[PDB]
Tab-separated table of C-alpha atoms in Angstrom:
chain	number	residue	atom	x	y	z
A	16	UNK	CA	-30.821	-17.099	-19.055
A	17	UNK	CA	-28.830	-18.661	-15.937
A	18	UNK	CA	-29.522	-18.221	-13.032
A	19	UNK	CA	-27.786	-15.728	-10.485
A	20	UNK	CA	-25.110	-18.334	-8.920
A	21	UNK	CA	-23.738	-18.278	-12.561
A	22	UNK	CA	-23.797	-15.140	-14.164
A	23	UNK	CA	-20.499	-13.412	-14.697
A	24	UNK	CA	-19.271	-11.034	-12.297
A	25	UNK	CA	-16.046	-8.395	-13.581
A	26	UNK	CA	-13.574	-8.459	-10.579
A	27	UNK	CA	-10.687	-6.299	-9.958
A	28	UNK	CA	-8.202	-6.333	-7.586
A	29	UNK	CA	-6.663	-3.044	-5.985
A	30	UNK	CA	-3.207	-4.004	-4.508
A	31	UNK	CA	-1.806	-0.860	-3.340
A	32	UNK	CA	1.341	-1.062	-1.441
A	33	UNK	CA	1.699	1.169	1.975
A	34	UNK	CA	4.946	1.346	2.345
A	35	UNK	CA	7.986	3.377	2.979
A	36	UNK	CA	8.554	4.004	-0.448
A	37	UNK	CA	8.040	7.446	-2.493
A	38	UNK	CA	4.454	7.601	-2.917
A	39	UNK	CA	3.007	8.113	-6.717
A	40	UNK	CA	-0.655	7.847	-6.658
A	41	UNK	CA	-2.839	9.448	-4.036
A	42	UNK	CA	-5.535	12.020	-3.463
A	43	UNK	CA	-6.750	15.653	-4.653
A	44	UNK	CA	-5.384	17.507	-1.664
A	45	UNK	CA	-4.322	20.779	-2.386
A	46	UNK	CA	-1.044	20.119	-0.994
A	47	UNK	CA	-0.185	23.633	0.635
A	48	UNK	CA	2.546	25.750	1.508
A	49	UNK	CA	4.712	24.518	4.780
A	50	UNK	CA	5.860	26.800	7.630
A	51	UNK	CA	8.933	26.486	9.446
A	52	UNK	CA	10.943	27.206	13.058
A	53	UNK	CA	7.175	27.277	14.279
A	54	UNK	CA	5.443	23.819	15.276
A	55	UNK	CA	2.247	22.605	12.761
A	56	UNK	CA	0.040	19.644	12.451
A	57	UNK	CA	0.837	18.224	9.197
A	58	UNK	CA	0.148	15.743	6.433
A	59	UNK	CA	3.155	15.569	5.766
A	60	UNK	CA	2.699	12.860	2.493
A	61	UNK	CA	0.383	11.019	4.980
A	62	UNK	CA	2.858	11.152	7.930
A	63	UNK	CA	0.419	12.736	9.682
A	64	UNK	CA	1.962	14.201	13.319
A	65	UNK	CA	2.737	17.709	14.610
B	7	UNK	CA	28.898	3.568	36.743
B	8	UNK	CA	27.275	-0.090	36.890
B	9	UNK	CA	23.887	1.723	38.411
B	10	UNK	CA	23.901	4.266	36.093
B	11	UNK	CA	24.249	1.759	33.180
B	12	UNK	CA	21.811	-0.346	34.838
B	13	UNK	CA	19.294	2.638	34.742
B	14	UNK	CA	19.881	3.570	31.261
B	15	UNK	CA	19.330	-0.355	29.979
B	16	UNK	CA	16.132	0.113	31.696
B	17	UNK	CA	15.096	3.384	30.415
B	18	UNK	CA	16.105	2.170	27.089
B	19	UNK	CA	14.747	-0.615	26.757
B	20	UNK	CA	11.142	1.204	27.589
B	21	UNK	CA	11.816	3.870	25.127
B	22	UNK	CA	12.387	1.042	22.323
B	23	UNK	CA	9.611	-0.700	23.724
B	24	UNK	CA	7.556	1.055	21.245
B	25	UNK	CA	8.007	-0.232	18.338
B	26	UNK	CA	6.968	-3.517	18.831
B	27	UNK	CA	3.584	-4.340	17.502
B	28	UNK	CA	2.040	-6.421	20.129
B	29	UNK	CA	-0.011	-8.144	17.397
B	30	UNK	CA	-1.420	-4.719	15.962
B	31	UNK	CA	-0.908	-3.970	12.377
B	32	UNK	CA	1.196	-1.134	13.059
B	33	UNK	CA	3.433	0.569	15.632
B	34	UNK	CA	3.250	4.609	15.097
B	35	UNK	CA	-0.018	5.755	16.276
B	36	UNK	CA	-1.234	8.137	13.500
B	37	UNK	CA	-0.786	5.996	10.592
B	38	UNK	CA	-2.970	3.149	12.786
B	39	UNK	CA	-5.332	6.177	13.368
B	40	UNK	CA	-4.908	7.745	9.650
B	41	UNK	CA	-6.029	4.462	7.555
B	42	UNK	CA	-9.009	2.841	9.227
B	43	UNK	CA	-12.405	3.722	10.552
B	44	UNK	CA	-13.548	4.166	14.129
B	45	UNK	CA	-15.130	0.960	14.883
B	46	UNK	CA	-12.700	-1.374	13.118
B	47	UNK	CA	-9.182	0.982	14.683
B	48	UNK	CA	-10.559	1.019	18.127
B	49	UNK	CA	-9.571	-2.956	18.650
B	50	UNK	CA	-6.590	-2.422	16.968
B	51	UNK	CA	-5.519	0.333	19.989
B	52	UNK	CA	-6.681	-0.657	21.892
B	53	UNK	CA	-4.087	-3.660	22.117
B	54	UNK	CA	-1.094	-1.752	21.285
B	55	UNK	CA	-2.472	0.489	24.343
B	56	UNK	CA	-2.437	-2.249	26.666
């Protein structure tokens, strides 16, 4: 019965660290084949550059 | 040799210019560009651009 000021809210906290280090949770890309000797646009494991 | 040094500390000094901040929260432009949202990166280069 209390009012809204009081009623409990669930919180979570998503600390994700973006970093240098090897990443080991990320999206559903479909992470495909590279090419090489010939210059691409990639995302490269979110280094994105060409 | 002193003016060619002298040139090269200049030259060098504006390559490594770059990776200074200046206050953003980053220093390589894609990653800047590649985690936020148009109207909340735009402030963010535009100070590293100036």
């Amino acid at each position: 019965t209390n009012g809204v000021g009081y009623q409990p809210y669930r919180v979570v906290v998503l600390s994700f660290e973006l970093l240098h280090a090897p990443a080991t949770v990320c999206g559903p890309k479909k992470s495909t084949n590279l090419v090489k000797n010939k210059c691409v646009n990639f995302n490269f494991n979110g280094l994105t550059g060409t | 040799q002193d003016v060619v040094n002298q040139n090269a500390q200049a030259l060098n000094t504006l390559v490594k210019q770059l990776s200074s901040n200046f206050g953003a929260i980053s220093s390589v432009l894609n990653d800047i560009l590649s985690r936020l949202d148009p109207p909340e990166a735009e402030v963010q280069i535009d100070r590293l651009i100036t």
